[PDB]
C-alpha cells in the first residue's frame, strides 16, 4: 500500500487585479465578478467560497492535501466567476510539487496564465511525516492549539473475529472526530477480512479519540464498537500500535485487528 511522501498545506489567501466578467444593462456597463477557486492535488479537490463583486478577493482559506511519490504530481488551480449559467474563467496556475518539496516554504504572488491580467497570493507549506513524537509539542504551538492538522492518522483494518450473529454482513466505520470513512462490506460472515488502509487528518492527538463502529449493513443492528484515545499512541514506538482490540456492546470474544500509526506534520528548512 502507498504511503504519503508528505502533506501540502495550501493557504488560499487572495488574488488581485482579476478579469471582470459580468455586465449590467444588456452589457452596456462593464462590471466586476464573483471569484472563487478550484484547487486540485491528485484526486483531492478543493473549492473556495464565492466572494461577490470584487477583483481583489480575500479568501484566507486553507486546505490540506496528501502527496505521494507518484509521477510528476502537480498542484492545479483554476479561478472562476460565479455566474448563474456557465462560470466564466478567471485564470489558471500549475505548480510542480517536486519543486515545492525542495523549497519547503513559499510565500509568493503568481501571475495567472491564459488571462490578460490577474495575480494570486499563495503560501505553501510542505509538511513531512515524522515518526517520532519529538516535535509534536512545537507543531501544536505553531498551529496555536487552544483548526488545521498537527498530525496524520494512518490505520490499517485487518480483520475482526467472532462477531455477534442467523449470520451478519459486517462493515466497519471509523471516525476520528468529525471526519468519517467506511471500509468495504463482507457478506454473511462473523470473521471478516478487509485488509484496507485509511488516512485521517488530526488537529490535536492529545484531545481526539478514534471511534470505531462495526455494523451489519443489511440491518440497523450494531456489531460492536471501540474507542482509542490517540494520546495512547503518543507513548508507543514510532507512535504506532498494532494489536487485537476488544469490542464493546459486542460478544465477549469479539475483537478487531488493526495497525494504527501517527505521524507529526513538520515543516523544516
Ligand atoms: Ca460573468
Ligand atoms: Ca458573476
Ligand atoms: Ca453557474
Curated annotation (Swiss-Prot):
Widely expressed with high level in cerebellum. Ca(2+) 1 binds at residues 21-22, 81, 83, 88. Ca(2+) 3 binds at residues 83, 85, 87. Residues 1-110, 135-249 form the C2 domain. Ca(2+) 2 binds at residues 22, 34, 81-83. It is found in: Cell membrane; Endoplasmic reticulum membrane. Tethers the endoplasmic reticulum to the cell membrane and promotes the formation of appositions between the endoplasmic reticulum and the cell membrane. Binds glycerophospholipids in a barrel-like domain and may play a role in cellular lipid transport. Plays a role in FGF signaling via its role in the rapid internalization of FGFR1 that has been activated by FGF1 binding; this occurs most likely via the AP-2 complex. Promotes the localization of SACM1L at endoplasmic reticulum-plasma membrane contact sites (EPCS). Belongs to the extended synaptotagmin family. Homodimer. Interacts with ESYT1 and ESYT3. Interacts with FGFR1 that has been activated by FGF1 binding. Interacts with the AP-2 complex; identified in a complex with the AP-2 complex and FGFR1. This is Extended synaptotagmin-2. It comes from Homo sapiens. The chain holds residues 380 to 659 of 921 of the full protein.
